[PDB]
From a paper:
Here, we solved a 3.2 Å resolution structure of GLIC in complex with propionate obtained from crystals grown in a solution buffered at pH 4.0 using 100 mM propionate instead of acetate. The overall structure was similar to the acetate-bound structure (root-mean-square deviation of below 0.3 Å calculated over 310 residues), and no significant remodelling of the intrasubunit and intersubunit pockets was observed upon propionate binding. Besides this sub-orthosteric intersubunit site, we show here that the intrasubunit site can accommodate some of the carboxylates described in this study, namely propionate and succinate. At the molecular level, all of the carboxylates bind to the intersubunit site that partially overlaps the pLGIC orthosteric site, but only acetate, propionate and succinate bind in the intrasubunit vestibular site.
GLIC is a bacterial homologue of the pentameric ligand-gated ion channels (pLGICs) that mediate the fast chemical neurotransmission of nerve signalling in eukaryotes. Because the activation and allosteric modulation features are conserved among prokaryotic and eukaryotic pLGICs, GLIC is commonly used as a model to study the allosteric transition and structural pharmacology of pLGICs. Here, experimental evidence for carboxylate binding to GLIC is provided by solving its X-ray structures with a series of monocarboxylate and dicarboxylate derivatives, and two carboxylate-binding sites are described: (i) the ‘intersubunit’ site that partially overlaps the canonical pLGIC orthosteric site and (ii) the ‘intrasubunit’ vestibular site, which is only occupied by a subset of the described derivatives.
Author numbering:
A (entry chain A), B (entry chain B), C (entry chain C), D (entry chain D), E (entry chain E): 5 to 315
Amino acid sequence: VSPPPPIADEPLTVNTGIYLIECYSLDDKAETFKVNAFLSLSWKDRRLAFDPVRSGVRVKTYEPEAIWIPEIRFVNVENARDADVVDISVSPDGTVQYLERFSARVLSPLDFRRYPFDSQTLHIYLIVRSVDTRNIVLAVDLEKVGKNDDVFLTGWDIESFTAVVKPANFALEDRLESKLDYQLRISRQYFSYIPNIILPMLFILFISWTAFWSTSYEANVTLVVSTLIAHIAFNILVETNLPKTPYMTYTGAIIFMIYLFYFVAVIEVTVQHYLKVESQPARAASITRASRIAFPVVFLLANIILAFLFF
Amino acid sequence: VSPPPPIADEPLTVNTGIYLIECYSLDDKAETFKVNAFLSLSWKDRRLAFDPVRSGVRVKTYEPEAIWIPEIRFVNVENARDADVVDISVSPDGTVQYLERFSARVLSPLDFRRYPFDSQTLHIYLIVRSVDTRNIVLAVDLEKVGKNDDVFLTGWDIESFTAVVKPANFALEDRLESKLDYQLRISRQYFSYIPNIILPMLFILFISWTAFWSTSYEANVTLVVSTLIAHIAFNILVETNLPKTPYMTYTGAIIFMIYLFYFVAVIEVTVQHYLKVESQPARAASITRASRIAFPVVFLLANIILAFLFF
Amino acid sequence: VSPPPPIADEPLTVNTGIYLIECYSLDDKAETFKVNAFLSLSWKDRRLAFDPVRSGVRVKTYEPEAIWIPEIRFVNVENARDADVVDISVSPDGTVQYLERFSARVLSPLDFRRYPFDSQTLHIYLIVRSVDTRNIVLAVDLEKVGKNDDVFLTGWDIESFTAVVKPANFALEDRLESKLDYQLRISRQYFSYIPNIILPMLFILFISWTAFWSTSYEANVTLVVSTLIAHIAFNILVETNLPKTPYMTYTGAIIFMIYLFYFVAVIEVTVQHYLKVESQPARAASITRASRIAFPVVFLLANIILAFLFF
Amino acid sequence: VSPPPPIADEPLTVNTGIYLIECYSLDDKAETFKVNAFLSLSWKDRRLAFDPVRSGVRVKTYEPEAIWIPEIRFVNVENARDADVVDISVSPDGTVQYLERFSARVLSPLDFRRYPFDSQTLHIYLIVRSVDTRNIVLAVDLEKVGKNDDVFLTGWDIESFTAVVKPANFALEDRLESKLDYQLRISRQYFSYIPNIILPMLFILFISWTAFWSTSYEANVTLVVSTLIAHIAFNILVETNLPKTPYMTYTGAIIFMIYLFYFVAVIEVTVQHYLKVESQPARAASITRASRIAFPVVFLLANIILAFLFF
Amino acid sequence: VSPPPPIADEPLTVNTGIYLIECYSLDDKAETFKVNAFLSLSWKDRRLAFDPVRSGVRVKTYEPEAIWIPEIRFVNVENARDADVVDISVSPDGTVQYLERFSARVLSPLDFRRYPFDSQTLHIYLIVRSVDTRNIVLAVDLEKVGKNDDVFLTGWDIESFTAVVKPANFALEDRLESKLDYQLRISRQYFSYIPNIILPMLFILFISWTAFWSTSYEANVTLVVSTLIAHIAFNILVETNLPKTPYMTYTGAIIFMIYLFYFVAVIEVTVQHYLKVESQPARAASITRASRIAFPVVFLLANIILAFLFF
Ligand SMILES: [Cl-]
Ligand SMILES: [Cl-]
Ligand SMILES: [Cl-]
Ligand SMILES: [Cl-]
Ligand SMILES: [Cl-]
Ligand SMILES: [Cl-]
Ligand SMILES: [Cl-]
Ligand code: NA
Ligand code: NA
Ligand code: NA
Ligand code: NA
Ligand code: NA
Ligand code: NA
């Protein structure tokens, strides 16, 4: 078996199409996702053409080893896809119609800057290395690109599955390569983050602020220190569901900013006590009374600034 | 090897049957379940007809590669099933009786709204793609569909294993497809949740309410703060055994509601102190005395409302 | 290849034997165990008989594909066993002696009611499906059933490896089936549970009871609350090494019972304070003096009751 | 293919040799370790002997399927080794020189009595089963047993790789077996345990002892209770890196012993307070002054006793 | 198939080249990394040479089994690489051009001394064992060595991918071996460590130092003890992302040093109280006033010393 010969000096166009059957296991830390899909390929081989009159059949079914099949690979995969050939069908003119059902772990990097209010564009890169005889160029058959209705990705909303129709052909090791881009747009389901992380994290912060309505230093220390410990637990729980990013995330910004409010609340609680012991509770009272308004106002403005910068 | 030819213009009916041997590893986070079962297939291939007078044997046994076997696949699987052919038996009329024992991790979505007092309907989807020569339609052989008595799923009660007899015949990529639905009904064993999560989480809440029978603000802060920290541990322990859902779960609702009771208890504990220091313990006493009745009544009614909304 | 023909109308007896080489990875949560053992099979095939005086050779060695071998499978396995044929030897009369070394993950349910003072009976179920020509029945060759001396299972004491000699012959999908039961009796090594869980869990409880020799409510709150937090940590550490059972475990019972002692200690600590503030420390003293005797006595009796109920 | 015939009535000696290429993943909980090594085998087969004069070659290279190769297996392995044949070479006298590169997960039990100041002897057991024709005996070719210099095992110091030259010949299932022992001596790198576990665990204990220079019961309760909670965290952190042993470990002994010092410190702290309230601070002072000397002396002596018993 | 014969007595030079497609999963604890790359091989086989004028063809394509291919292996791999042959092309003179796309988990040790401000040199070792007929020597074809622009390693900056052109030729088990070194230089992205570990760990330390501006021993105990517990949580969180090293890491040094500051702060807090009770608050005040300057100065200098020693 060898590639079909060119009629003139034109490259062989292999029409592609991916139809997603099952979408699952999106690892945020590993920036991977597992896919189960159909792969449809179509090319013209004149050597396989026949007259439907003499042959007595309008279509001929072949085994993979019997005829020449182009070496189609995925760029961003962990290991080689678990392919299983469904059907190979030849038309009288010699147009081969290949179909296989595969499963692979895809390496698609994620952008956590707006986490957990982020949207992602997952990529599937189809590639073909040109042979010495003739060059192979990929094309998108929009009729054979899709996803079924039951495709669900846990914790994500599947927006669309499209393909960049124009391939990005390039030279690699003195041979041509045709690359295609299959984009799967998704958006995070941030609902669970509100009652599990955001709201309990805010309650522990407001509970620490009840120290501006107390003169008991021993109770204030317990209030601001204990709630800080709960924030450390929340900061740890968050950084376990996320990878180490060289940029600041939206949640990461808020979490880090809250570590300063706890630090300033400790300073205020110490100042109030030092002034009380120094027999000047008039200054201690005015600082405490100011903090009652300062802390919520600065916190609310700081969040408006952050949310503005991130969105 | 090619498909059997039609006597008239009828599609080939492949009679199916799944018999569950072992049911294991139900992942709640991944919404998967591993199954070890028998798969029985039956189709008429007249091309395999024989005379037992001549051949010597009443029933003929073939190897999988020897004869044509229909390409039966599962829709909702992670990877291709680990199949092992048990027996292929052809009768003189050509009726093939296929039997294989497989193992696959099935992708069946779960509903955690009533967790841990929820019931699920797990699905197994058999599918067959029609060939160019003739169409293939699936059928259920109710005699060969079941599960053995020893089938146990850890933490679950296995109700039934049935099949939707009428197949879903639909067009996919210009070819006909026959889909079958194998439903496995299960219900959760909620017993362990009561002494491990529900009751210890209630004890820590009632312990916080002993602050309504105390005038010691420093002891009250320790009481309401420390028990809130224990409740954060309980909220974390629960959200680790569950996936991030875009809906509110029953336990998630209760856990979140308890966060408000700790927040209001902190306000009461602060109010009582502020009034005591302001030299008006008559107001502080009446608020504290009211909270002794208010907190248990509101909590009891709020739970009746939630349980009503969820069930 | 086809099954040996019956001399009369008797079923083919396949003599079995499992010899455990390596026993490892007992997962308590998954109720699985990995095994590496020898499997010996023996049946009579007259078609393979030869004259000992003529042939010269006493025994004939065959390849697996050359001769007919019965399809022996395991019922309670995750996936198909990793078998490797060691030797196939035929006697002059036609008795075949098969030997293979396998490795499989076995699904054997566990009983945690007496945990960590529990004993288990692990099962290995051999099964054979009868063919259309003749029926196949399993038998135990007690000479070829065993385990080597070096077989160690981490955290467990291996008692015995026996087989239920009488097979379970039953009908499944219109064909006969012969099932064998290989039982491996083990008992847990509870030594590590005493200094790591039981004794530290008792020390934290007795430390909470030092609040019956204190009048300082602020110190008593710290004592009873802080120790409860440590007990929650132990309750969590325990439920992570165990699966969700629909029954009460022995440790689970003790752990849950201790939650009540903390709850009553909190009530006593609150009562003592309420009476002190109410200017009647005579009642507060008598309640505190009684609890010094009540708490250890009730705890000691409650444990005798539990241990009695469980053992 | 069949085994070489004996010249007299001598058993076939297969000369072995393992050369470790890569040593990795020593699981302490699972008592396993992965290996990547060369396996060299050598036996005399007269049936393959040739004259180098007429052949015109000093050596002859064969494929594995072409000639008879002895079935060499490993006793203590999880699954069958991932073998890849490097070279098969035959000398004119018929001496076969086999070489393969394998990878296997070895089951070698560990002794944690002196942990983390322990040394281990890892085992690799080569085994050969004798055939009906003639018996097979293993031998060590010390020239072909080694390990490369770059062999590193994370957290361990690799001492030596030697083999017990005399094989253990024994009967198993009516057939003779030749077993060889390849011992890999290693010793733990205990450096990381000192600043991460030992020293931080000692600091928290000495911090608890500052309660012998304080009369504030509320502060002493906070001191001894809080530090005990940190010790529980250290006790848990340690038991997660170790399997459940039916013996006491060196670290396990120290950790458990410290639990008693925390218990006696709580008793002393309670005694001091009870005596203070009972208006006899002269007794309370003498007990507190004694504990300042008693606690460090008893702790220092108790450690000398333990270290002596363990080493 | 056998190796090409030497024209004189020269060894066969196999020109190599690795082109990295995907770089992923760098395990710090396991000191491993998964790669997906192209492997290009080139050698001269005169037995395959042909005339380009009469043959009409300039290049001839062969199957792997058709022609002799050198046994190229990787030294530092877990298991054998998942290779898939892309193309085999022969030139008129007999120069073979092999290309395969592989995936393997590489064992490359890491240096954590400057963690998380460390840089690593990952290694890939190509090796070839010489045959009895002739010796095989490796060479680097710098034209076919590279990495694509999209190669991303989570949490790391990929500097370069180069190869040590001169191979290490050495004797192993009486046969010659040729080894090549492919070095992949990377540097850690330390950005995430600052707001998640470094800065929160510093805030809790400075919060403990507010005890130098307080006379309340009960509040000082709460301050220094509670913050130390948070530091233990940070020490644990760090030692989980790192393997047990026989050397001191930069973070490990800082974390351990901070343990001493908490220990000295506890001593100061005890000294201040003992002097206050001893009715000499003039000495207690001067010690407390000195510690206000001492603790930040000593900490700042100690860090300059450490950073100097490590960098
Ligand atoms: Cl691929
Ligand atoms: Cl280009
Ligand atoms: Cl090109
Ligand atoms: Cl399937
Ligand atoms: Cl099996
Ligand atoms: Cl093996
Ligand atoms: Cl390799
Ligand atoms: Na082909
Ligand atoms: Na077939
Ligand atoms: Na306190
Ligand atoms: Na057979
Ligand atoms: Na052989
Ligand atoms: Na070859």
